[PDB]
Amino acid sequence: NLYFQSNALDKINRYAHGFVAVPVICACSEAGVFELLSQKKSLKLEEIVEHLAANSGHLMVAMRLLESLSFLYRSQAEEYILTEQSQQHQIIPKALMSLYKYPFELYLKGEVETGISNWINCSSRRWDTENSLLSDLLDGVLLIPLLLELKKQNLLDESKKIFNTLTNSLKQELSTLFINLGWAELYLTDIGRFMRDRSLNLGTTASYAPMLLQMKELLFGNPQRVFQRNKTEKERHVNRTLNVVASGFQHEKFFADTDKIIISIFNQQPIEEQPIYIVDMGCGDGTLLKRIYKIIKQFSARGKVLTEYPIIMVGVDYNQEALDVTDKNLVDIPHLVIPGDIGAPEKLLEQLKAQGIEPEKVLHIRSFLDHDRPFIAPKNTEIAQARSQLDYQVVDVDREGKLIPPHIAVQSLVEHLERWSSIITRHGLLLLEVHSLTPAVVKKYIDESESLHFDAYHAFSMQHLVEADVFLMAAAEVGLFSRKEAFRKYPKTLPLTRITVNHFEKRKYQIRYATVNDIPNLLKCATFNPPVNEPFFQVLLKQTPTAHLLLEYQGELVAAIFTETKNSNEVLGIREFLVRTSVENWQVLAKDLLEFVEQWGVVKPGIKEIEGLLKYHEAISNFQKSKWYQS
């Protein structure tokens, strides 16, 4: 915990930002996006799409990135307007895009005709701008592939004398760069060691270089040429090898967060009623399954009695090579590997039954896969219709590169979780997932959070991130609730959620957003505040369409909690509490709703604090004494 680390952390994150942002800015500049918004200053996305013959989905990804960088702003009519910062697009050299295919391997080996001296000189001048952020964005285009190769060839871990075995010209090139950057003084400095030790965190972003090189095709050409799939069906938009290595390394601290959940499950008495099978959908190399088994064996009551009550780990994956690797990795662990697909839980269930596996004895688990499912369009058009008036900000791009409407992306996730919800047992569903943020929050935490680059390259590659609150809502709509004692989120202390660790349990009821359509039923409920009239409900529902929660059981309204969002959208407050005391177990259910509102508010983008929990907990906990109206 040293003083220099806070600036170093900002720098490395900014480098990853620039790795994605510079291709977006350059492609937009070349196609005339900034010029168009200078000739006509207020344009909606559809107008920009039409006039530049753009692909609406990828273009939305680019616009959200530019908004997050404060290059553009959106009016209340959803019209894009340039800012003074957007003139920075003129400072970017467009030859800089050549680095995305420059052979850094050959360069470090002296087998290259043309080196990188021009860019080293550019960096020393801070790219001819005083905007510190901007010069860090451009630095990232160069430094990310270079640092990764310097680490890969073991040119930085070398004791003391780094660059000592390189040709003298190479020595001076990299010595100048490292000295100019404060990385070396020839010995590495504090920041120099920091950048080297943390290089693999850039691997996932760096692996999308082939896609980012083709940004102009994504935005303005034929997106499918970027995503080939030839005969061997190797991915062309990403170096999956480096990607899988890097993401596995990053997924490490999150796997450890399943320890407390696993320890809790397999300490639960009696042993015979615990799960027998732990089934990981998308097992990859089996790292998570292997860890879980060792945790059970060493740290749980179940681990003392495996002789009498064995555990069986089950790896499921739609790729046979993954099953083979997982099979080998789970040597000496009782296990099974079977094919399956994240989108087909019904087929998984039938394959388990074909093995004689008793479905009710299964704990289902998975990590970081729901957002990478094959997108299935909504079949429930009526629920999709209702959903369409809500203000979701999910960005999701289809195979043609067109924008999937946010409410359609959400309804797809709901229906996909419903298919899973129908097979989840009383042992529940251990689920880790990564989430996108809104541009308002990304803009506010640009130096502290990875979202700017991570959300962009995810949406560009046709993955389906949602914001963390949207995910928890989609689960709640189908009766899956993330258990309070198991939950973890990252980042821990910033008002934004990029990662959730969940133990979902299946409950008999559902929680969804209240809508204007619910107002007649809401008017009839018992209510802690004096009875609310329709206009105030309309006011609340109009101002924050996705901030009021209701709990339903067998089509019957049980309870509802309305909220207010205030103070630069940093404070969420409980505003109304409604119940129907005619429904069996309504008080327990209403307490569950208030607990859910707290969890949901904890992951709501931008929310720093929740007000009113004590007041409204007391209201429902001492119901008769609190003297509710219309009871």
Ligand X SMILES: C[S@@+](CC[C@H](N)C(=O)[O-])C[C@H]1O[C@@H](n2cnc3c(N)ncnc32)[C@H](O)[C@@H]1O
Binding-site annotation: residue ranges for S-adenosyl-L-homocysteine = 251, 317-318, 341-342, 367
Separation between Cα atoms, residue 509 and residue 285, nearest integer Å:
36
Q: Which of 47, 235, 257, 341 binds ligand X (CB under 6 A)?
A: 341
- The size of the interface with Mn ion (CB under 5 A), counted in residues, is 2
Q: Considering CB distances under 5 to 8 angstroms, the limit depending on partner class, which of ligand X, Mn ion, none binds residue 317?
A: ligand X
Contact at 8 Å (CB) between 318 and 402?
no
**352-391 residues near Mn ion, rule: CB under 5 A:** 372
Beta bridge partners of 506: 480
Instruction: Pick the closer one to ligand X by CB: 319 or 422.
Output: 319
Distance (Å, rounded) from C-alpha 143 to C-alpha 96? 12
Task: Name which position in 139, 149, 317, 450 contacts ligand X (CB under 6 A).
Answer: 317
CA nearest neighbour of 436 among 400, 412, 460, 405: 460
205 by DSSP, 3-state: which? helix
Nearer to ligand X, 108 or 288 (CB): 288
Contact string 230-259 vs ligand X (x = CB under 6 A):
---------------------x--------
Rounded Cα gap, residues 234 and 471, in angstroms: 30
Partners of residue 79 on adjacent β-strands: 44
Q: Which residue of 224, 228, 319, 320 would you call a contact of ligand X, by CB under 6 A?
A: 319
Q: Give the shortest CB-313-to-ligand X separation in angstroms.
A: 13
The residue among 276, 163, 174, 210 whose CA lies nearest residue 460 is: 210
Which partner from the list Mn ion, ligand X, none does 284 bind, CB cut-off 5 to 8 Å by kind?
Answer: ligand X
Count of residues interacting with ligand X (CB under 6 A) = 17
CB of 207 to Mn ion, least distance (A): 11
The interface with Mn ion within residues 449-468 (CB under 5 A) comprises: 463
Q: Compute the chain's Rg from CA coordinates.
A: 26
Select from 18, 145, 223, 282 the one that contacts ligand X (CB under 6 A).
282
Please tell me the distance from the alpha carbon of residue 592 to that of residue 27, in angstroms, as a whole number: 49
| Candidate residues 88, 205, 367, 449; the one interacting with ligand X per rule CB under 6 A | 367
Residue 401 near which of Mn ion, ligand X, none (CB within 5-8 Å, type-dependent): none
Nearer to Mn ion, 372 or 595 (CB): 372
Residue 375 to residue 396: CA distance in whole angstroms:
10
**Shortest distance, position 211 Cβ to ligand X, whole Å:** 16
d(CA 378, CA 411): 6
* Annotated binding-site ranges: 251, 317-318, 341-342, 367, 371, 458, 463
User: What is residue 2's three-state secondary structure?
Assistant: coil
Total count of residues recorded for the chain: 631
Give the integer Cα–Cα distance in Å for 545 and 518.
13
Nearer to ligand X, 93 or 248 (CB): 248
Q: Which contiguous run of DSSP H or E holds residue 42? A: none
Residues in the annotated binding site for S-adenosyl-L-methionine:
251, 317-318, 341-342, 367
DSSP 303-364: GG-TTTS--EEEEEES-HHHHHHHHHHTTTS-EEEEE--TT-HHHHHHHHHHTT--GGGEEE
Nearer to ligand X, 199 or 258 (CB): 258
317-325, 494-502, 513-521, 601-609 -> range binding ligand X (CB under 6 A)? 317-325
Residue 318 binds ligand X (CB under 6 A): yes
Stretch that binds ligand X, among 264-272, 340-348, 443-451, 463-471 (CB under 6 A): 340-348
Q: Which residue is nearest to ligand X (CB)?
A: 282
Residue with tokens 């994956």: 317
Q: Which does 251 bind (CB under 5 to 8 A by kind): ligand X, Mn ion, none?
A: ligand X
- Run of H or E residues at 47: helix 45-52
The Cβ of residue 308 has, within 10 Å, a number of other Cβ atoms equal to 8
**Contacting positions for ligand X (CB under 6 A):** 251, 282, 284, 288, 317-319, 322, 341-343, 367-369, 372-374
